[PDB]
Design a protein around this ligand. Structure first.
Ligand SMILES: [Mg+2]
Ligand SMILES: [Mg+2]
Ligand SMILES: [Mg+2]
Ligand SMILES: [Mg+2]
Ligand SMILES: [Mg+2]
Ligand SMILES: [Mg+2]
Ligand SMILES: [Mg+2]
Ligand SMILES: [Mg+2]
Ligand SMILES: [Mg+2]
Ligand SMILES: [Mg+2]
Ligand SMILES: [Mg+2]
Ligand SMILES: [Mg+2]
Ligand SMILES: [Mg+2]
Ligand SMILES: [Mg+2]
Ligand SMILES: [Mg+2]
Ligand SMILES: [Mg+2]
Ligand SMILES: [Mg+2]
Ligand SMILES: [Mg+2]
Ligand SMILES: [Mg+2]
Ligand SMILES: [Mg+2]
Ligand SMILES: [Mg+2]
Ligand SMILES: [Mg+2]
Ligand SMILES: [Mg+2]
Ligand SMILES: [Mg+2]
Lengths: 197, 106, 137, 51, 172, 98
RNA sequence: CUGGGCCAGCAUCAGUUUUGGUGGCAGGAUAAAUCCAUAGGAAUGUAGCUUGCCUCGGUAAGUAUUAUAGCCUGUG
RNA sequence: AGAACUGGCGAUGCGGGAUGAACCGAACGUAGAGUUAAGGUGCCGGAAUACACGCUCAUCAGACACCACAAAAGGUGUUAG
RNA sequence: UUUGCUCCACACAAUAUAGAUGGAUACGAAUAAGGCGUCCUUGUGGCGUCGCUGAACCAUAGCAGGCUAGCAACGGUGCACUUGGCGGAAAGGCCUUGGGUGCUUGCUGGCGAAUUGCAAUGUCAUUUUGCGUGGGGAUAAAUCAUUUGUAUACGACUUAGA
């Protein structure tokens, strides 16, 4: 329905979000995921730190080079959960995966474009209150990721900018309302009202 | 008239298939806007088109069409089934497709 | 400040006479009253005026409105109708942005093609006179 | 050459069994029952509602 | 065994010239259709009297519709059931509108907690606890207080479409 | 089996024409057709027997001017006829009244 | 240029089928309820009344079974 | 290792059990349309991120017959009795 | 080495395309809480309102959108210019100033359409790549060989030579 759908992956659950995205691609919807480092995972931090360490201990014995590749960034962790749910070894698989981009923080083309959420993957909606969980970016520097502070820094900087953007916009829509008012209660108004508009 | 479209937007998802065997002879279409089988009943029988480009010109045209109609509903969520005169190319899974408002009973 | 400040979430409570909007089923979209509480997940509702039959209903397929009228617990259908009427609950429902939007939604969905056309035009008509306003100050 | 099923196509429905014409005509695929005020004895309801 | 109906089942021994008119026996039976009802009537009868159905007949089978099916009730339920290692008797209460309603949560509740499938459970007696404060199991007494009212924190509206252009609120 | 269509020509350029019911959405607006002759038009009228007959052209005006006469008694109907129909983003045919 | 050959759309049907709308009947505790009449009762006790508390607004305990809410159970 | 009755594999593909002689379903001319079995329906993957009541939080949870194991003994975890 | 080479315009013949067909419409944060409005002591502040979904908002009428005459606005919008600024996470984009120009369905008129015959067949998107013109532009290096030995099985590496 849109050409590209941008997902603020904040507060989402890794594999559920993963799941919807893998289907969205296979059906030909271009997707970019952003803020991949504020992605959630159910279960307390230690468990997932432990779970990851399992993943780590797996490597081709005679040549660790060809072994399973342990990507440590949140984007890449998240991209793992996704690839797992796509038949990536086929052309159809590759094609699907080429419709996908994942980022940590929200880099420049997207920083000024609307993002959406995916309610059936929203942690706050799905998880039962009280149930413990894990933050991805924090999982990642835990197991080696190098750019948690660099992203937070560029994010705080984006957040200033984006909020003055919003302050100004909110101030403009104020105007159009106080422009409108005049015609809010007009005769055409009433006629539109008769039609649900 | 920025809009000129007299059709509903579709995607080509799959051939009909079990876990390990596909039937090329039926295509599973996903009609945009259709959540439930009850809806998808509207479009049954209505003609579909897949429209692709080529290199060799034919009817003075580099654009071609594969035609067929929506034939029965699929599953619980508005996916619907379709047969075409020929059989869609499978490279087209996830391609766009077009579902027209005729044959009509409106 | 020098007061103690405590904002407390102000939920719609399930309580006899809580009036509820029915979400799913044959009595969808209709209002009923909560008459008695079966358990933490289930209540007794009755919707006399709107034609929804006194029944046990799972709380999940209902959404609490912010309305509440006075009702004795477990009151037969009749006195609900008496009480509900007395309180003018329909009247207060209709007055809400919630009740109004539902109406709008249905109105919109009722429009002829020709009517959609007409909205477009008048909307163009209003637009023009707005943009200028949006430029005189 | 071709099996026709009287449960559709009235023609073969009437080929077999002519009485269908009248059956239909007199409705009686409905047909109201009579009417009787015979109420059930006391012991019948006692036991029914018994513990 | 599912959406429950309650049945009266009335049956007797087959008449003998020596005993024309044998005594009639009745059970209340909860089953989903009447075949299972009749079948249950024998199951139990066989364990109480010395009789199998090949030597008896079923006289009547009538559904017992709840008398006041919109009055909320507190139910006493006595049960005999089989665990993996013993068999036991068990009282519990259920607040609901009908007997048929109650029995169904009874049957689910036994599976949830003591992992007892339908087959391994005998329903001893079921009964409307007349005078409140004859209710003993707290998890029903809890609902009996004057002007009982409570909220339903953390609303989770299900979604119709997979993308949402707004961050949801859980506010009821 | 076809349907006689008229446009009308002076409103949206479409002539007195044949059309199959099965490729048409029947809207819920209607114009009175009481003043309109129409009984001369049949199959053989359209019969394949380029240039355009003067009959076709003159018949057009005859039928049209009456319809246009009736159309004008109702506002924005005349415009509505000249506009083309196109589905928009967010139109679901299986819902729309027309 | 017309016939053929092939393809296609519509219409009326035949066979198989899938999916909707709608009419009339039958049964049961001749459903059970709601509803109505009436007898009787209670409390998670409605109004009065009683006594301390009050901001003389109201309130608490206690009395009190329809009253200035209502509910339950029986029969019809 | 060795007998009893029967059904199988061997001689036999098909659908399910990821996989697999033997389980489950079902046996086979060339095909169209329908419906199902056993088994499934978050994504890989065709099919409800369906409905309903509970239960469970594991710094070693658990997740389906044949089947790819776990026991005595313990726990003021938590549930019902 | 004789052909050249580079940027921008618009011009043909190929060639390709995981799939345009009104718009990807920018706070952050919490969810046992929040958005918006408004005032203030600019705060864990006071009042008012909203949700119960985007079933929104915006845009959309004109030969696939023609020709033609006017009123009312002083607006909308497209284009090529122009004044200021901001954007380095991949900023390659964003706001802003001044006219110019086409369109304007805000409104009122005059024309056009057929016969493509009752659906087939219909708007042409953007990649590369070669050739064509008219203008602006720029006027080198790497390898072989020879040589060094901080290098070396051979390739490779490292030096040097107008
Ligand atoms: Mg998770
Ligand atoms: Mg594979
Ligand atoms: Mg299929
Ligand atoms: Mg709240
Ligand atoms: Mg026109
Ligand atoms: Mg037929
Ligand atoms: Mg009464
Ligand atoms: Mg076998
Ligand atoms: Mg052999
Ligand atoms: Mg076999
Ligand atoms: Mg297995
Ligand atoms: Mg996989
Ligand atoms: Mg699927
Ligand atoms: Mg989910
Ligand atoms: Mg076992
Ligand atoms: Mg224990
Ligand atoms: Mg507020
Ligand atoms: Mg919010
Ligand atoms: Mg405040
Ligand atoms: Mg909006
Ligand atoms: Mg043209
Ligand atoms: Mg990028
Ligand atoms: Mg066609
Ligand atoms: Mg050396």
């Amino acid at each position: 329905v849109e050409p590209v759908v941008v997902i603020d992956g904040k507060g989402h659950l890794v594999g559920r979000l993963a799941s919807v995205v893998a289907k969205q691609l296979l059906n030909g919807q271009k997707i970019v995921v952003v803020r991949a480092e504020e992605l959630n995972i159910s279960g307390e931090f230690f468990r997932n730190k432990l779970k990851y360490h399992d993943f780590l201990r797996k490597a081709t014995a005679f040549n660790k080079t060809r072994g399973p590749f342990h990507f440590r960034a949140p984007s890449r962790i998240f991209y793992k959960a996704l690839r797992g749910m796509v038949s990536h070894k086929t052309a159809r698989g590759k094609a699907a995966l080429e419709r996908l981009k994942v980022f940590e923080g929200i880099p420049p083309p997207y920083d000024k474009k609307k993002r959406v959420v995916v309610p059936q993957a929203l942690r706050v909606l799905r998880l039962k209150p009280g149930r413990k969980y894990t933050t991805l970016g924090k999982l990642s520097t835990s197991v080696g990721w190098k750019y948690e502070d660099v992203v937070a820094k560029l994010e705080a900087k984006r957040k200033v900018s984006s909020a003055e953007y919003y302050a100004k916009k909110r101030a403009f829509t104020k105007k159009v309302a106080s422009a409108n008012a005049t015609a809010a209660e007009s005769d055409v108004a009433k006629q539109l009202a008769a039609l649900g508009y | 008239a920025e809009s000129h479209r007299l059709y509903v937007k579709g995607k080509h998802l799959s051939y009909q298939r079990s876990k390990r065997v596909n039937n090329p002879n039926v295509s599973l279409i996903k009609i945009e806007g259709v959540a439930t089988p009850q809806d998808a009943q509207f479009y049954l029988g209505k003609r579909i088109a897949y429209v692709y480009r080529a290199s060799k010109e034919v009817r003075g045209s580099k654009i071609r069409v594969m035609w067929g109609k929506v034939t029965r509903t699929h599953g619980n969520s508005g996916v619907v089934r379709a047969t075409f005169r020929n059989n869609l190319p499978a490279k087209t899974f996830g391609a766009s497709v077009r579902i027209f408002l005729y044959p009509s009973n409106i | 400040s020098t007061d103690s400040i405590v904002k407390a979430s102000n939920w719609r409570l399930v309580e006899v006479g809580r009036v509820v909007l029915i979400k799913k089923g044959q009595s969808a979209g209709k209002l009923a009253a909560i008459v008695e509480i079966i358990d933490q997940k289930k209540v007794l509702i009755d919707g006399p005026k709107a034609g929804v039959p006194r029944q046990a209903i799972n709380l999940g397929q209902v959404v609490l409105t912010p309305l509440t009228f006075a009702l004795p617990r477990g009151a037969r259908t009749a006195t609900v109708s008496k009480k509900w009427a007395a309180a003018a609950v329909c009247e207060k429902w209709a007055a809400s942005s919630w009740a109004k939007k539902i109406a709008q939604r249905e109105r919109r969905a009722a429009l002829t093609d020709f009517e959609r056309f007409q909205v477009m035009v008048l909307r163009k008509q209003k637009r023009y006179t707005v943009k200028k306003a949006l430029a005189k100050a | 050459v071709l099996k026709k099923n009287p449960l559709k196509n009235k023609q073969v429905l009437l080929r077999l069994n002519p009485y269908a014409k009248v059956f239909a005509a007199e409705k009686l695929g409905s047909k109201k029952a009579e009417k009787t005020g015979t109420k059930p004895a006391a012991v019948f309801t006692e036991t029914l509602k018994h513990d | 065994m599912a959406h429950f109906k309650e049945y009266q089942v009335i049956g007797r021994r087959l008449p003998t010239e020596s005993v024309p008119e044998p005594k009639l026996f009745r059970m209340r039976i909860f089953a989903s259709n009447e075949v299972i009802a009749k079948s249950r009537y024998w199951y139990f009868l066989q364990k109480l009297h010395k009789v199998k159905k090949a030597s008896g007949e079923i006289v009547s089978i009538n559904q017992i519709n709840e008398a006041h099916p919109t009055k909320v009730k507190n139910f006493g339920v006595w049960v005999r059931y089989d665990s993996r290692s013993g068999t036991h008797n068990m009282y519990k209460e259920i607040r609901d509108v009908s007997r048929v309603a109650a029995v169904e949560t009874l049957y689910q509740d036994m599976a949830a907690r003591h992992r007892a499938r339908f087959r391994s459970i005998h329903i001893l007696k079921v009964a409307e606890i007349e005078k409140t404060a004859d209710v003993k199991r707290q998890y029903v007494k809890q609902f009996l207080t004057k002007d009982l009212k409570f909220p339903l924190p953390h609303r989770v509206q299900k979604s119709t479409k997979t993308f949402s252009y707004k961050r949801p609120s859980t506010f009821y | 089996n076809t349907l006689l269509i008229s446009g009308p020509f002076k409103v949206n350029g479409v002539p007195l024409r044949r059309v199959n019911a099965r490729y048409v959405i029947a809207t819920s607006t209607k114009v009175s057709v009481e003043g309109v002759n129409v009984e001369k038009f049949n199959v053989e009228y359209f019969a394949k027997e380029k240039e355009i007959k003067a009959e076709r052209v003159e018949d057009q005006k005859v039928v049209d001017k009456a319809l246009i006469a009736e159309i004008k008694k109702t506002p924005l109907l005349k415009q509505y006829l000249s506009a083309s129909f196109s589905l928009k983003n967010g139109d679901k045919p299986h819902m729309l009244k027309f």
